[PDB]
Amino acid sequence: GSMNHYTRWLELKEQNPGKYARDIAGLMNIREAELAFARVTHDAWRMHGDIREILAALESVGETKCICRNEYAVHEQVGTFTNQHLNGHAGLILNPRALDLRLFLNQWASVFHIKENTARGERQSIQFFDHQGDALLKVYATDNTDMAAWSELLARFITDENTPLELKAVDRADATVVEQEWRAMTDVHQFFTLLKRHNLTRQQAFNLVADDLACKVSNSALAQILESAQQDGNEIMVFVGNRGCVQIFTGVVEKVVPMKGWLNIFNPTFTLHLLEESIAEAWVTRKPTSDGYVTSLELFAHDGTQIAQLYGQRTEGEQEQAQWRKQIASLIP
């Protein structure tokens, strides 16, 4: 099983130097947590412990570079595990414009440390995986990480026991009612509960309601909006997530560059990689806040995966940013 997986990963990595662990796990038809598991005794170590305690321990290491992704978009943010509030219904690590995470901790299953050779030299990380075996979040040490605290954290949580993963499979509405309840919300954070009640996916909800609430726009909309944001210099939010973790960039888009088959943002502390041909549907949605409404661009793949979502920057108590509204208005047929 896992020896053969390790060997095969070494072969495929040599053959495909441009491809990363997630892609090679994909070529092998295994989940990424299974590739981490196979690398134990080589360049990975299993970790154990209460997930909140591990996350709290990360505050001690200082700067990290965190990667959160789905199949179609990769979000990389340099910052610190400060301002943690992990204990509620969902968890958060609240640092607008730096490391800003929203956590669904019931999805968090296994954790590994990887200390690996790469073309750019040794990299160390702590990697979290869900019950399906998919990556949730990867936390990399940088040249600024407190490596004494990093080593102390690893000694605290690394275990020699690499126990079996036991991976698991993933688990007609009234349009007038859905619409009226959407209009009646007083905060965007109620929307997920709305979907859950009506047992709807996001796109199913968007297809039900009037166009002033959810309007389909060009699949080129993300490119258009990133070009406008880069030109205009207004702050936006870029959300990229998966079933267990969403990472949120807030700030100005400094550089947008297509490269190697992806649309990239190259900012000083943040990088986005988005596979543009993966966008199957793009929606502009309007949802109420306590002060007014806000407007989002929401992107979906063919399988219905939410690739990314964008908003303007906004502080509690303020109206939606004027420039962002103007940029979105340019998308509406």
**Is 234 a binder of ligand HEM (CB under 6 A)?**
no
CB of 188 to ligand HEM, least distance (A): 4
* Closer residue to ligand HEM in complex, CB, 258/292: 292
Q: For the chain, how far is it from start to end, CA to CA, in angstroms?
A: 54
Contact flags string 11-50 toward ligand HEM, x per CB under 6 A: ----------------------------------------
Q: E-strand spans in 160-261?
A: 214-217, 236-241, 245-251, 256-259
Amino acid at 321: Q
State how far the Cα of 293 lies from the Cα of 14, in Å rounded to an integer.
Answer: 51
**Is 127 a binder of ligand HEM (CB under 6 A)?**
no
Contact flags string 254-293 toward ligand HEM, x per CB under 6 A: ---------------------------------x-x----
CB of 189 to ligand HEM, least distance (A): 6
Question: Which residues participate in the annotated binding site for heme b?
Answer: 189, 202, 287, 309, 311, 314
**Is 185 a binder of ligand HEM (CB under 6 A)?**
no
**Is 249 a binder of ligand HEM (CB under 6 A)?**
no
Using an 8 Å Cβ cutoff, are 263 and 274 in contact? yes
Element (H, E) at 119: none
Q: Is 307 helix (H, G, I), strand (E, B) or coil?
A: strand
Residue choice 97, 102, 123, 243 for contact with ligand HEM (CB under 6 A): 102
DSSP 319: P
DSSP 321: P
**Is 301 a binder of ligand HEM (CB under 6 A)?**
no
Residue choice 311, 324, 327, 331 for contact with ligand HEM (CB under 6 A): 311
State how far the Cα of 311 lies from the Cα of 319, in Å rounded to an integer.
Answer: 13
Question: Going edge to edge, which strands form the sheet with 256-259?
Answer: 44-47, 108-116, 123-130, 135-141, 64-69, 73-79, 270-274, 262-266, 256-259
* Closer residue to ligand HEM in complex, CB, 81/311: 311
Stretch touching ligand HEM by CB under 6 A, among 58-66, 89-97, 134-142, 171-179: 89-97
Burial of 329 (0-12, 13-18, 19+ CB in 10 A): exposed
**Is 108 a binder of ligand HEM (CB under 6 A)?**
no
Look up tokens 């210099």; give the residue.
233
Give 76's strand partners: 67, 271
**Is 80 a binder of ligand HEM (CB under 6 A)?**
no
**Is 129 a binder of ligand HEM (CB under 6 A)?**
no
**Is 86 a binder of ligand HEM (CB under 6 A)?**
no
Rounded (to 5) percent helix, strand, coil in the chain: 30, 30, 40
- 155 CB-near residues (< 8 Å, 6+ apart): none
State how far the Cα of 286 lies from the Cα of 294, in Å rounded to an integer.
Answer: 6
Residue choice 278, 296, 306, 327 for contact with ligand HEM (CB under 6 A): 296
**Is 93 a binder of ligand HEM (CB under 6 A)?**
no
Question: Which residues participate in the annotated binding site?
Answer: 189, 202, 287, 309, 311, 314
CB of 281 to ligand HEM, least distance (A): 15
Residue ranges that bind ligand HEM, judged by CB under 6 A: 90, 92, 94, 102, 188-189, 191, 287, 289, 294, 296, 311, 314
